[PDB]
Design a protein around this ligand. Structure first.
Ligand SMILES: CC(=O)N[C@@H]1[C@@H](O)[C@H](O[C@@H]2O[C@H](CO[C@]3(C(=O)O)C[C@H](O)[C@@H](NC(C)=O)[C@H]([C@H](O)[C@H](O)CO)O3)[C@H](O)[C@H](O)[C@H]2O)[C@@H](CO)O[C@H]1O
Ligand SMILES: CC(=O)N[C@@H]1[C@@H](O)[C@H](O[C@@H]2O[C@H](CO[C@]3(C(=O)O)C[C@H](O)[C@@H](NC(C)=O)[C@H]([C@H](O)[C@H](O)CO)O3)[C@H](O)[C@H](O)[C@H]2O)[C@@H](CO)O[C@H]1O
Ligand SMILES: CC(=O)N[C@@H]1[C@@H](O)[C@H](O[C@@H]2O[C@H](CO[C@]3(C(=O)O)C[C@H](O)[C@@H](NC(C)=O)[C@H]([C@H](O)[C@H](O)CO)O3)[C@H](O)[C@H](O)[C@H]2O)[C@@H](CO)O[C@H]1O
Ligand SMILES: *[C@@H]1O[C@H](CO)[C@@H](O[C@@H]2O[C@H](CO)[C@@H](O[C@@H]3O[C@H](CO)[C@@H](O)[C@H](O)[C@@H]3O)[C@H](O)[C@H]2NC(C)=O)[C@H](O)[C@H]1NC(C)=O
Ligand SMILES: *[C@@H]1O[C@H](CO)[C@@H](O[C@@H]2O[C@H](CO)[C@@H](O)[C@H](O)[C@H]2NC(C)=O)[C@H](O)[C@H]1NC(C)=O
Ligand SMILES: *[C@@H]1O[C@H](CO)[C@@H](O)[C@H](O)[C@H]1NC(C)=O
Ligand SMILES: *[C@@H]1O[C@H](CO)[C@@H](O)[C@H](O)[C@H]1NC(C)=O
Lengths: 164, 321, 321, 164, 321, 163
């Protein structure tokens, strides 16, 4: 992936996290579990929803009867009409195919970007109060209860609360 | 104590293509391509299409005796013909500007048939009883329901003059015909006058027709021909027929307000009471999506026709459970 | 001591749409869509359009007496008609291949009227004095200025033969007409010959016309009709008219050099001395941008028509003051 | 944003910096102020100018008269002509809309990328001679005068001068 | 001890354009634009084109004597005319619906000429020997090979009636002509009957012609004219000719199965036994790439024509040696 | 470049590396030399090949004869036919040109992303067992022999062994 997170330094996804696209897995003395990150998930949903709706809704349609009837002394204009229909077909098929190919690439990149940004945001607030393992994980140098890790997910984590 | 950053995975088997990689399994996706239809011919703009039964448009307009399902709605949003619409002009000849007329009738409102020249009162000096085996009904020789075959009464065919003023407040479609006997003997037997003519005129229409007597191959066992003509008579205008012979006179005509932008579908699919915004010869389709592979020739507000068998847009991410 | 990395912000209220997000405020942007026009009909290719005053193209070419406005240019890049172009064929009938002619005359680099068959000397054996109340000038019956109504002289209409050789070094547009009396009595009264015909021929053109006599409604109080015809005669070729009746003869014709690729604009927007590369019925537009929403039917080198109300391209970045 | 800088770990833009798109804010004993990074700004300007010019100039325009006139027995070809105009209209409207949507996203991505690349270039030269807070700022572990601050902006910063 | 991460460079001078930067040198690239052709006219669908040589389609079909060495196949995938195709209708006049006929004959599968009305037995009471200096061969007056100029035998031209039934199991193309003398003396001299007519009829086709006698400019030294007509006779159908004069009668006709969707190429390029899926007047081209700049006018399954001089896709990366 | 590696903090390419798009230059006591990274190179090849083939193969047309003939009373439909041909020419020329411009940019981004990703993978493996120079080079804090250098290129590098 372009941003190197999904199928990246984070090798796989979580079937355990049902409630969002991006999120956290935590483990402390109180237990372990999954939590989706609502801000990044909802922002992604809004973005992707906007893209799909753009592709669908920017299509403008007027009432059209495509077919025309020509007699046997009208062959030339009959083939002109066919050239128009066939020409529109070539254009829409090619463009629709490539639009989907290209924008699927961008959608998957977008997700990759979102995971990386989330990761680096968490990294910045924790700083040296935690160790970076790899695979997207941080080992705290202090004890973080459900209230503390919630502050990490909330973006409110207090660095000079903790030391050592 | 640890916290990890990760992303969603699930049991989705959905695949999409990307410019870099084919067949990528993703957690969520949406279809951009309408690939199915309902197998029905439906109403467009809330109005059913015209169904002509055994007949094509020519047979319906002229009143081919094999149609005789003479009841039409006052409006229709398009026209359906089937593999069973075989009954056209039963007496052979040319139908002038046939495709243009079919186009102009593809959608209409306020459509009504009326008796423009009543058979009983319109022709005191001519015989109206002419029939032909070429247009038969119930095993008997017959004729078009909307036209009258005028022939001589008792060895004389005097010059006729008949006019109609359109007071209907909308266009009147007038159809008529001109008969061309195979022999001069037939000409005399039918119309008495070897020098016969038919003249038709209005504000925009001007023509004089002369019988063309010639050897021709028999079609439906007729060496003669009837050419069929029409005009859309404007509100307030007059149309005038004069003939010393060979006139196949209007009997019934049609008043209408022509619509626009519709067409004719040829399909054997059954007509139903459903509503659609896009009709194909195969059946109606949902018009919500931008692309369809059902059929290039459509009537409605329709997705663009494409050759694609699959257009699927990734929404969720790469599925890696 | 500190150093910070940052990015520009400003007071810009410019917004753009992105595939992920609507209405994003950006520091700088550019418009790709031409949404304005100057409300005028301008010169195209540095050349003014043809203006016909009270007349349409037919009235101008035939010399409808109400077209006596003498100022027409010797060249034009396109033709303007307005809601006031009312004076056409004043004697009712069909102008054959009218649309083709309008198209083919839409731009010319030289245009001159000349007397092809002088009235005084061209027809010693026929009457040239025919007029009609249908074409009136100053309260008196008159006729087209560029055509001549030939009728019988003293109970005789001998076969006429008249030829013109085109020495003009360019195409000559020759127009004529064929008159269609309502009755055979009127035919003889005018042209004496019931069997009358008109023949027109050149190296490329060959056509014969015969009167179509029919009882018809009065149009502009005329039961008669005149059909109008034309051909472009090549430099060096000859055109020959023969008639036993019903010919409405060329009097004046036009020598010209046709341009190509132009058309007719129907607009009441005022014509001005301004210059444009792209003309719309609403007014001229700037052609520098790739897209325009002003009007689909244009003449010139024009941006592509789109239904878009906004196409604005981000150049700068998200504005976050 | 895709690269996580603009509206990212750098929260807002500077109205104080008039002379460029990307740049620096410095603070020392000699005072503070804004300075644009001329190289990255101009490279972006050149790039974006080329993008805009491509979208505008690749359009071929030849002299065309779109309009056509038909008589009342020409309805079929009249509607053929309409299908042509309307078909080109559908194609150009859809493609123009999506081109602008897609390339606006890419333009905003491009700026985001440039800010990130600038930030990381400065990070690379300063190394451990400065502390990384966040919000795009570095606190030096030494005194940095206007000559020193210029070396940072010029990319000429001397690391083992100030390792002190 | 060190390890470094890096990327490829090479001696490639290949350049591509990008949206942000022009003329970027890259290590590897591929061409998307077919810019070359083979300078040959090749077979389409495994079938060679029809080559008409000195003749155009009209001359070939009518049997212009300069066409007699033309070796024609029973099938062709398209038709080639050259700058040398001059020999058409050698007797001046109009070829009716000529462009339509050319279009409909552009590809055919089983094409055969046959004698529809044998010269020896079909016309005992009319002269078949008529020739003209206007169609000359090797300096002697001659005539179309596939038609016969029928004139009076010994001061009389009796009414002729001749019918052909199409038993060929495919369409039959029938061509004929109608002659229009410059004077009534020529009419009488040729056909004797001033009142002459030609009638042609079938199940579908019905038309009547009368001589148009008029002074006209000489073309190929002929003041007279011959108009040329045709119809495609369906399997099983009958065509009937009746004439009291002026008929240029079918002698030979053509049985054929029309193909579809092909056309006419005008080219001076040599025909060769090569195969192509896309043919241009300049020569055949490869259809593998999506775009071509060789020629706007093509026949086949073809890349899309573009105005581009270069479309080159980066594959490798920025080349920085 | 978008990802800041190519013509970035890695200033130039290696003519010395013939066998791949992305790779390593090593220096140790045993000598120096170039090695291409096969996984990232081949993945890039597969991706770009798919892109090119997509652009080419998605074009499909049917048998068509473009040319039409009209007489001198057919000027309107002749010009209609021309409006059609010219319209297709405008659409395809514009779209082909921009498609190539836009996708060439994306291809160069892709390579840039790939180089950056490789760099970050090695960085991730070495950690503080090596020093970051900035030209895309890592100077080891221990001795790395051809077996050690190979483990870095293979992604099997053992950090707690050389700590
Ligand atoms: C005027 C007349 O009766 N002429 C006789 C010919 O019709 C007849 O030739 C045979 O005609 C057959 C068809 O007969 C009808 C028909 O179409 O059914 C009989 C209709 O009553 C008659 N219609 C009217 C109004 O009189 C109709 C009409 O004559 C023709 O349509 C005129 O074109 O003919 C059938 O075509 C046979 O194939 C044909 O031989 C001949 C010989 O029997 O006698 C004529 O007197
Ligand atoms: C041949 C003829 O004179 N016929 C007489 C009818 O015209 C006439 O019917 C009335 O005609 C009125 C029009 O009269 C003109 C005209 O258009 O102004 C008079 C013109 O001098 C004459 N022009 C020529 C060259 O002869 C012109 C011409 O005859 C017709 O246009 C030919 O179609 O007619 C007007 O239309 C009235 O509405 C109409 O009743 C009748 C009745 O008097 O007598 C006919 O002899
Ligand atoms: C009927 C006839 O012979 N008429 C004579 C005129 O043709 C002749 O005018 C000259 O005719 C010249 C052409 O002569 C041919 C030709 O086309 O070569 C001679 C052909 O044998 C004849 N074909 C037949 C079947 O009779 C052909 C034919 O008459 C015309 O094509 C009919 O339209 O004419 C050429 O056009 C000269 O330019 C022209 O002056 C006059 C004068 O000598 O005498 C007529 O008897
Ligand atoms: C040039 O065009 C003008 C139109 O601006 C013609 O002028 C007049 O047009 C009106 C209709 O718009 C005619 O009205 C008619 O009036 C008679 C009574 O006189 C009535 O019976 C009819 O039903 C109709 O409503 C009016 O007559 C007409 N004026 C004249 C003098 O004919 C004008 O005719 C045109 N001239 C030419 C030479 O084309
Ligand atoms: C209506 O159409 C049917 C077509 O099915 C016509 O029926 C044919 O009539 C001919 C002539 O009598 C017969 O030889 C055929 O065998 C019939 N075909 C079938 C399938 O029945 C019928 O003649 C038409 N009638 C009218 C008045 O147009
Ligand atoms: C079209 O199908 C149904 C209409 O029956 C509609 O609800 C649906 O939303 C449309 N398709 C998609 C993919 O939205
Ligand atoms: C066209 O001229 C210039 C150049 O594009 C532009 O500033 C001007 O606004 C345009 N004309 C109009 C009437 O907008």
């Amino acid at each position: 992936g372009l941003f190197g997170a999904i199928a990246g330094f984070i090798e796989g996804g979580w079937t355990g996290m049902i409630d969002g696209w991006y999120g956290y897995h935590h483990q402390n003395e109180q237990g372990s579990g999954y939590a989706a990150d609502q801000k990044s998930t909802q922002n992604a949903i809004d973005g992707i929803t906007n893209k799909v709706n753009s592709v669908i809704e920017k299509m403008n349609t007027q009432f059209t009867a495509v077919g025309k009837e020509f007699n046997n002394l009208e062959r030339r204009i009959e083939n002109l009409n066919k050239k128009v229909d066939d020409g529109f077909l070539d254009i829409w098929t090619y463009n629709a195919e490539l639009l989907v190919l290209l924008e699927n690439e961008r959608t998957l990149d977008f997700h990759d970007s979102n995971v990386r940004n989330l990761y680096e945001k968490v990294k910045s607030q924790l700083k040296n109060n935690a160790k970076e393992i790899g695979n997207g994980c941080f080992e705290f140098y202090h004890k973080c209860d459900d209230a503390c890790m919630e502050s990490v997910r909330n973006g409110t984590y207090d660095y000079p609360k903790y030391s050592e | 104590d640890t916290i990890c950053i990760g992303y969603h995975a699930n049991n989705s088997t959905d695949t999409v293509d990307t410019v870099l990689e084919k067949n990528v399994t993703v957690t969520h996706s949406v279809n951009l391509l309408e690939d199915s239809h309902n197998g029905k011919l439906c109403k467009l703009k809330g109005i059913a299409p015209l169904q002509l039964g055994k007949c094509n448009i020519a047979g319906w307009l002229l009143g081919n005796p094999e149609c005789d399902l003479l009841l039409t709605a006052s409006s229709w949003s398009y026209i359906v013909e089937t593999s069973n619409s075989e009954n056209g002009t039963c007496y052979p000849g040319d139908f002038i500007d046939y495709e243009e007329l079919r186009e102009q009738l593809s959608s209409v409102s306020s459509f009504e048939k009326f008796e423009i020249f009543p058979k009983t009162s319109s022709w005191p000096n001519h015989e109206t009883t002419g029939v032909t085996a070429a247009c038969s009904y119930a095993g008997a020789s017959s004729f078009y329901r909307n036209l009258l075959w005028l022939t001589k009464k008792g060895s004389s065919y005097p010059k006729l003059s008949k006019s109609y003023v359109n007071n209907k407040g909308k266009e009147v479609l007038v159809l008529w015909g001109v008969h061309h006997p195979p022999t001069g003997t037939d000409q005399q037997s039918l119309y008495q006058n070897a020098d016969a003519y038919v003249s038709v005129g209005s504000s925009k229409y001007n023509r004089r027709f002369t019988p063309e007597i010639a050897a021709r191959p028999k079609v439906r066992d007729q060496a003669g021909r009837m050419n069929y003509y029409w005009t859309l008579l404007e509100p307030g205008d007059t149309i005038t027929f004069e003939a010393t012979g060979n006139l196949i006179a209007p009997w019934y005509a049609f008043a209408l307000n022509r619509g626009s932008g519709s067409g004719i579908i040829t399909s054997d699919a059954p007509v139903h009471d459903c509503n659609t915004k896009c009709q194909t010869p195969h059946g109606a389709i949902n018009s919500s999506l931008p692309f369809q592979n059902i059929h290039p020739v459509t009537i409605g507000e329709c997705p663009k026709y494409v050759r694609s068998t699959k257009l699927r847009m990734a929404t969720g991410l790469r599925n890696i459970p």
